Amino acid sequence: PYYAFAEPFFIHAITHLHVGSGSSVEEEIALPFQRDELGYPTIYASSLKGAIKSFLLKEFPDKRDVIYKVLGEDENPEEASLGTFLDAILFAIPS
RNA sequence: AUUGAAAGUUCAAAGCUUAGAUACCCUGGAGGGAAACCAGACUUAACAC
């Protein structure tokens, strides 16, 4: 099929989370959480990918190439990333 | 009365074919919900003398 593996996961906030969208003019708060098209909080796949990729590059120093092969090259990308992240959808929020 | 006179560079003809604005890229870093502030002020009235 198109994807070799498809591994969904859940994202559980251990501490509080701030993933920002950066100070719009129509907002009221000046550092709001990333919303989505419907208005629910979300984590854009770009934020997810950058955070996870930096973490992995520092926590698996012997597998950078593997990581680089799957998540993309930082410098001079001769090819696309094999791996894809979807925008993290809000599953359940404490109220 | 001229090495002259006369004679349409004309006709037919698709700038088309194949081709992903894609690849890599964390709204992050820095920043004390603080600063000021008395739970206080005062007895008065009545009649008796």
UniProtKB/TrEMBL annotation:
Q: What residue ranges carry the coiled-coil annotation?
A: none
What is the protein name given in its UniProt record? CRISPR-associated RAMP protein, Cmr4 family
Q: Which residues of the full protein are shown?
A: 2 to 96 of 286
